[PDB]
Amino acid sequence: SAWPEEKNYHQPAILNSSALRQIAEGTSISEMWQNDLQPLLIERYPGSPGSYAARQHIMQRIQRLQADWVLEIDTFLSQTPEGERSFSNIISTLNPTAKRHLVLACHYDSKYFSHRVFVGATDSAVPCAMMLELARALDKKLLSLKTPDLSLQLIFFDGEEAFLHWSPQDSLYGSRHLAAKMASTPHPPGARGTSQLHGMDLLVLLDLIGAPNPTFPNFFPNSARWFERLQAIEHELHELGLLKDHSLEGRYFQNYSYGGVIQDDHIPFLRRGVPVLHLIPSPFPEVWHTMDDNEENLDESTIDNLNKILQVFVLEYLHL
User: What does the record give as the active site?
Assistant: First the structure.
């Protein structure tokens, strides 16, 4: 039937001032930092001990929550410039059999560099922490989903980074795999025509977050009305005095276009028709692909602000 089009007419349920205050109070940037971010600041390129530890960390942090998250590990083999490697996407789903999910994603691998070590704080340890912080902060509300046909999913992609220099064949290992897999998988089971890709309302991909004064442009016409929601949320939170070290002149969400094409985990989803809201700034952080992409260079207030915005957005999307 026509359920794959419901995404196109889906509206937010907009939060009042007293609700926005409650969400602002319910996230803890220091707990994220201590409990979510710090354990991820390790070398975690595919097959390294760090990759296994990051993966166990993300799963433990998720399982400890009340909401009925279902984890799945999507593990596969691929040739690389270094020889064959194993890769493990982490998918964490509420209500797997619901036709529709809002999808938040990042990558949890770190790009390999020869020796100081590269731990890619903004790239993408912070995105990971933010997702885990969202799950934690919204737990009580997300628990209410264990009872339209729409829920939430988190994807932590492996193998986003090139091993050598970026090419079509050396990058996006995990996202190219999972997109192809979802494209061939009936959803709901027993349905004709419709895939798991049909079920993805919107893919919200966080990447390179945590540098000061980020500017996210409005990359895609087909997510522009959700981008406008992010601008609105930032604007109301500011006016309500719920953001820190934030100016309307220095706002994160700015309605301008972007000139090129960014390659990232959304690419295999976008080319098959999935709507993408790509929360990657332009320019990239100053420390991009640098040993200085580290904890010290992160802006805690900025990240805390983005947490508030993203959490409101997600509640508003899911009607919670």
Answer: 160, 207
Tell me the technique behind this structure: X-ray
Backbone phi, then psi, for 119, in 5-degree steps? -120, 0
Q: Let me know: does 264 contact 280? Beta carbons within 8 Å.
A: yes
Domains of the chain (ranges plus CATH)? 28-220+252-301 (3.40.630.10)
User: Are the beta carbons of 67 and 94 closer than 8 angstroms?
Assistant: yes
* β-sheet with 150-157: strand ranges across: 70-78, 85-93, 150-157, 100-107, 200-206, 276-279
Q: List C-alpha distances in Å: 239 to 23, 234, 248, 256.
A: 15, 9, 9, 22
Cβ atoms of residues 120 and 291 within 8 Å: no
Residue 29: φ, ψ to 5°: -70, -30
Residue positions in the annotated binding site for Zn(2+)?
123, 161, 289
Residues carrying an active site annotation: 160, 207
